[PDB]
Structures are given as C-alpha cells and as structure tokens.
Structure 1
Amino acid sequence: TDPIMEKLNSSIAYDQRLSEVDIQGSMAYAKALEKAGILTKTELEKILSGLEKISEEWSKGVFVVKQSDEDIHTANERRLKELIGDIAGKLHTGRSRNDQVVTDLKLFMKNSLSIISTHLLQLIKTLVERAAIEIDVILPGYDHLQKAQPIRWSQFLLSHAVALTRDSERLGEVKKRINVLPLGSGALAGNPLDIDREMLRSELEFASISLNSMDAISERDFVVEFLSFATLLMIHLSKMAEDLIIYSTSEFGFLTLSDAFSTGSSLMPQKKNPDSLELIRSKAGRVFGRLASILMVLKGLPSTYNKDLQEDKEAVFDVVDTLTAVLQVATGVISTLQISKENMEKALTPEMLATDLALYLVRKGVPFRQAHTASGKAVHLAETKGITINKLSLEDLKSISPQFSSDVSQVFNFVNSVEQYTALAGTAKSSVTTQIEQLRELMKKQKEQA
C-alpha cells in the first residue's frame, strides 16, 4: 500500500528478460495441471495457444508492457487473461510466486551460463592459438615486477589460459546445480496437488528435480556460487589486464593495443590509453560487490521464504551482462594487440643468465652453494672488468672455477636459456607445445559438457 514500498517492490524495469522462461515455466505447469485433472484438454490447449502467442509477441518485440505491470510475472498474466479470459487464472492452482520465480531465475541462468561458456572458451582458445603462433618469442619473466629470467611469451599467455580453464570448469560445476528443477515446491511445504514434477523436469529440460521444498524455496546457493565463479574469473581478468597495461606502457614497450580497444588524442597520436583493459580490471570490483551483497543478504535469515531474497535478480542480471561484455572485450584485446618482438628481445640482458651460469656448474657436479658462489664471482669479475658475464673470457671463468669449459659459451644464449625447462609445465618449446595440446583437449571436453 505505501507508495515508496510499492516503488521498491516494482521490478518490471529490470526483469523483462525473464519473459520467455516465465512463459516456458507456465506452459510446463499447465500441462502438469491437465494431467492432474485441474485443467481439461480443451482448457490446456487454449492456454498453451495463448502462452505461445505471448512468447511470439516478446520474440518479435511487439509485447506491450502496461503501467499496471509491477513485474514480468504480472505482465505475462495480464496478457494471457486478455487473450483467453478467466481460464488463465487456473494456472495459479497449487503454484506459488515462491517456486515460480526461482524456477524462472534458474532457467534464465542456465541459458546465460551457456552463453558465458561460449565467450569464455573463445577467450581461452584465442590465448592458446596466439601462443601457438608466437611460440618463438622470448621476453623477461617478472618476479616482484623485476626482470628475473627469460621465458617464452607463450608461457605467459598460457599461464592466463590455464587459470581461465579452471574458471570454465567451475562454470560447469555451477551449471550442474542450477540445472535442477525447483518448480512444484509450492509456497513452502511442496506442491499440494500431487503434481507430476518429472513431467515438469522433462518439459523444462532440467537434469533432475529439487530434493526438499523448503530448501528449494529459500536457498540462493546457485546465485552465490555463480557470483563466486564470476568474481574469481574477474580476478584472473584483472591480473591479465594489469599485465597488459604495464607491458603496453612506453617504458616497457612490449605491445600496443589496437585502435578498437584503446582511446587516444589527435594531439598525441602515439599515446594509446588502454581503456579496454581498465574497464576489465574495474569490473572485478563491480562483480565482487554483487557477491558481497548476496552473502550479506542471506546471512542469518530464518527459514523459509523472506522478501530479502528478491535482491537476487539485479545482482545476477548485472554480473551476467558484465561477464558477457567483458569476456568479448578481452578476446578482442588479445586477438588484435600487436607485440614488439624487437623490444621484448632487447629486454633480455646477460645479467638474467647468472642463474643459468650456476646451473651450468650444477650439471657438471658442482654443489648448489658453490655453483652459486662461483656464478656470483663471475658477476663480480665482470663488473670490475667493466663488461658483462657473457663477455668474460674462458680464462676469466676458469680463474673462478676450473669446472668452466669452452661449452659454457652456450649458456649465453636466450633460446638455450628457456630450453632448459623441459620438465612438464615449463617454458621450453616442447613443454609449451604440450600445454597447448592439453588445453585444446580441455576446451573440447568443457565444450561438450556445456
């Protein structure tokens, strides 16, 4: 009754996208009511005909929302009544807004996750395929954002792809629990008409049916874990965005975003602002905010239904839209960015091979400590000689350790450096090739699970 309460309760402004799933839920329910003998066959066919008409109206974008419609459910109900009359009312028999709305949200989320999966797998495939093509590129691997050791650019790309693949796996786990029918739980204690929930499951294409009515009505686990999945995915995208923003600075100069995913001024044509990456990074907080809100909404609520649960819709809709846009923007950025092999290569310095120099002695039998001490001495000798370690003479090296032989010159090669990492998961070309094949197979498995 209160005008402000009334405004707070209205959701027609944001839930119209539930139009089709809402109709589908009603068609399925109508068929079950008919089996239960609540509707005659002629009544069922009139209702289905009407519902199908409404579906088409939304599909064609001709549906007319009216001022009285406070939500999508009321709008669809008004339209069906207009089309078929009083018979429409029988559809509420044994059904509650409590199980009808949660059914709508799950069907909607199932469909959204299917779309998110497509965009996520496309992002992963884009990283994997670019890694395959640019597998010969080498640049600095960073630790504490300080140059540490040479790595293949592809090992970097794949590190992001692997993390995203775990997000895809979580997406599949979340979808599995979402794909469980809640309809037929009634208001709280179950459907009172011995409704055939297996028929509802089959009609709505859910994988199984809810185990307990009170739980099905009041739980929002599916909302929470979708938000947890989305937040972790965003954390990964924020790390990738941070990496690309830094690598795109003029200071690092490793890559340049395309005009399509950056902003700039005619005054400074070469200055490309990574708008795309900053947008992506920022959405991690926007999504995390939604996760935080729902956990707080649910914390400490008693059984069974409480109006507090209505906050679920806006959080889900926002995150679905955000991920859909963000994943596609990320695919665009990765597929269209331009790397500078020249600058990546020039960043490789002899100082980054001192560890390899110690490793060289290790493979000759020199103990860890002594191998490192000797390498350190080579570094110091080079310094006092005013040169770099790759330029010390063999005689220079032997003055530090007789274990240094002429083959030590092979240490001072950046390809030889990355090729030491043949153990699985490493940056050697063979290891990177293996990861690309492993990821291609994971994507295939996940693609079919979806």
Structure 2
Amino acid sequence: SLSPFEHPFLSGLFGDSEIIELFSAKADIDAMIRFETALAQAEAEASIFADDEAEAIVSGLSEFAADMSALRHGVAKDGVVVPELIRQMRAAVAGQAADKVHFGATSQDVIDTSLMLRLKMAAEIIATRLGHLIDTLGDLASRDGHKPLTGYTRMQAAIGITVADRAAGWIAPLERHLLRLETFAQNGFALQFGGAAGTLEKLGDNAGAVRADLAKRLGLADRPQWHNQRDGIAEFANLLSLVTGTLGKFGQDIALMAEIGSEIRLSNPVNAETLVTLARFNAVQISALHQSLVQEQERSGAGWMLEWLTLPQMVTATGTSLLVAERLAAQIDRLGA
C-alpha cells in the first residue's frame, strides 16, 4: 500500500486502526447520510416543506446502503461523490419527498460537514490518548525522578540534573496540547452549510434558522459558511503537528540515552526513532494545509483537494505517535543511574 499506516505488514509499527477507521469510505458516507437526514429535519422545522416529506427522507435514509462502485463512477464522471450519492439517496426515498433531499445544499456542504463530524471524533480519541500518555509519563517521572542524569546541552555533557528535570520537557508541553485541543474542540468543529455560491439562496430569510437547527442536530458549531475560509483546518493541523513535534523530542531524547547506554534500561530503540520520523512527517505536511489557505473565489478545487490528500494522514500520524510513544514508555524500565 502507499502509506505505511495502512500497509499489511508496516502497520505492525505505523498502524492505528481506530483513527484510520474514521477516514474509511463507509464512515464518510454515514456522516454524509447524517448531514442529509438532519438537513431534511431542519427544513421541516422551518416550514420550507411539509413534515411528512422530511420523515419520508429520514426513514428512507435510515436503512440506506450505498453502491460503492457506482459512487466511484460518480467521482470519475463528476469529480466529486455527492451528485451520484444524492442520486442513490433519492432512489431510496418514497414519493415526491425524494425531490426534497439535498435542498439548499451544495457538494462542499456535505463533504466538509462529514469531515468535521469525523475530525471531531478523531480529536476526542487524541485527547483521551494525550491524557493517558501524560499519566504514563508522569508515572515514569514519579518512579525515577529523583535519580541523577548527566545533562547534555548542545551535544556536550553538562552539569548533573535529575530525571524529573528532563521529563518535564516531555510532559509540560503535552499538557499544553491537551488544553489547546480541548479549547479547540469547543467551537472548532463547524457545520458547513452555504449552498451553491455560499449565499444559501434557496432558503432566503430562513437561512439562519435552518443553519442553527442543522448544526445543533449534528452536534457541530453554527458558523457562516467557510467554503473558502480554511483557517480552522490549518489551526487544527498546527495542533496535530505540535503533538507529533513534542513526542519526537521525547523519542530523540530516549534514542540518545539508548546510544549512550549508561542512563536507561529498555525491555533497538525503534519506537524512539519512529517518533522522530512522525514529527518530521507532520512538520512537512503542515505546509500543505497552509498553502491551502489561498482558496480563490467562492470555491477552489485546487486548494480544497490538497487538504483531502494530506489532512487524514496528519491526524493518523498524531494518533500513531501517541500509540508508539505509549509503547516506548512501557519499554522504559529505568531512567537514570
């Protein structure tokens, strides 16, 4: 396979089946079904169309299973999945209520909202692993923290420090990232709902009320459309790379102590090297999300699709990093003399 994260043998090291499952084609489609179901309900609530048409959409979509091969044919034909997805959804809905699915929405609305739904779940997992890792590393520090370490500054031995002193440079930044992530998670996962040209012209003056209701139903933040405003995507990408960056410092430290040999015992430091790799991977990948801030006019295919290529691997690198760092810390049997 192209990426080691999903590779049938290399995933023994780089694997993260829990985070990767959220970027599966099935998970995307489920979240896209969620968008369309909630949209129909929000539009009934605002009396755009009748209640019995929205319930026909809900029940029609409740047991909706997609034809994957035909969805691929869709993106081969159109460039984007949603017109063929919507076609399949209308085929599942009884009566004239099928003409009402996807009303007022555009392709970017359903794709970006699905992304935000799944990024939200990925961030919950990442925070949980972050808090557990902070505890594990804290246990490494409370076990061996009093023991002397030879300090090292600029590749030379320096004065003696302790294990607690060195550990604080691993743990304290991780605590900051947890807090950064928790603050982000409060309103950073936003509904994408702006219509063909970002103006919601099919909804007129009901635009604001439908948007509010749809956001609440999906558990997402109500914000005006951000079809070309991608600063929250780059902000989340920054955080991802901040976490890998700190864990790569941890990995670089452990590998150096391993090479010196006198001041650790491990149960060769492959996990430590893997942390550095992932740090440097995310530090490269951050550039692509920042290049994608320049998204011209109302919708930019060039800028938008660079995020498709690069973001899922950034959140996987961060999750893998947390797994591998947990595996490394269990290998550490003593720090210090």
TM-score normalised by structure 1 residue count: 0.62
Look up the match of 1:415: none
Residue in structure 2 matching 1:302, options 281, 296, 300: 296
- Check the 8 A contact 1:197/1:209 in 2, yes or no: yes
Out of 163, 174, 186, the residue aligned to residue 164 of structure 1 is 174
Distance 1:20 1:123 in 2: 31
Partner of 1:254: 263
- Amino acid across the alignment from 1:332: R
> Which residue in 1 is equivalent to 2:198?
188
Report if the CA contact (8 A) 2:231-2:293 is conserved: no
**1:69 positional shift:** 4.1
Tell me, yes or no, if structure 1 residue 73 matches structure 2 residue 87: no
Is residue 200 from structure 1 mapped to residue 214 from structure 2 by the alignment? yes
Amino acid at match of 2:141: A
In the superposition, relative to structure 1, how do residues 253 and 78 fare at CA in structure 2: closer, same or farther (>3 Å)?
farther
Matches of 2:135 and 2:81 in 1, distance apart? 37
Segments of structure 2 that go 5 or more residues without pairing to the other structure are 1-22
8 Å Cα contact 2:35-2:218 kept in structure 1: yes
Q: What pairs with 1:122-161 in structure 2 (closer than 5 Å)?
A: 122-161=132-171
Q: Deviations over 1:278-327 (max 9, x none)?
A: 2221112221222111222333x433211121222232211111211110
1:51-85 CA distances to partner (integer Å, 9 max, x unpaired)? 2213xx5xxxxx64124343553564344234225
SS at match of 1:150: strand
The answer to whether residue 274 in structure 2 is matched with residue 279 in structure 1 is: yes
CA contact (8 A) 1:294 1:311 kept: yes
Residue-by-residue CA offset, 1:159-213 (whole Å, 9 max, x unaligned):
210011112222233333423333255532235311422211221112x421x44
Q: What code does the residue aligned with 2:298 have? A: T
The corresponding residue for 2:124 is 114
Q: 1:112 to 1:73 in 2, by over 3 A?
A: farther
The 5 A counterparts of 1:32-43 are 32-43=42-53
Q: Check the 8 A contact 1:95/1:187 in 2, yes or no.
A: no
Q: Which has the larger radius of gyration?
A: 1
CA distance in structure 2 between the partners assigned to 1:128 and 1:236 by the alignment = 15
Q: Which of 306, 328, 331 is the equivalent residue of 1:333?
A: 328
For 1:130 and 1:189, locate their aligned partners in 2 and report how far apart those are by CA, in whole Å. Answer: 54
Superposition misfits of 4+ residues, deviation over 4 angstroms: 13-16
| Structure-to-structure mapping, 1:256-405, within 5 angstroms | 256-258=265-267, 273-299=268-294, 301-308=295-302, 309-339=304-334, 344-345=336-337
Q: Which runs of 5+ in 1 are unaligned?
A: 1-12, 58-62, 259-272, 346-450
Distance in 1, matches of 2:26 and 2:84, equals 9
Match of 2:4 in 1: none
Query: Could you tell me whether the CA contact under 8 Å between 2:90 and 2:99 is conserved in 1?
Result: yes
Mapped partners of 1:69, 1:137: distance in 2: 63
Shift of 1:15: 4.7
Distance verdict in 2 for CA 1:180–1:296, change over 3 Å: closer
Q: Provide the secondary structure at the position in 2 that maps to 1:181.
A: coil
State the number of aligned residues: 303
Task: Kindly provide the amino acid, as one letter, of the partner of residue 168 in structure 2.
Answer: L
Alpha carbons 2:74, 2:81 under 8 Å: kept = yes
Contact conserved, 1:185 with 1:217, CA < 8 A, in 2? no
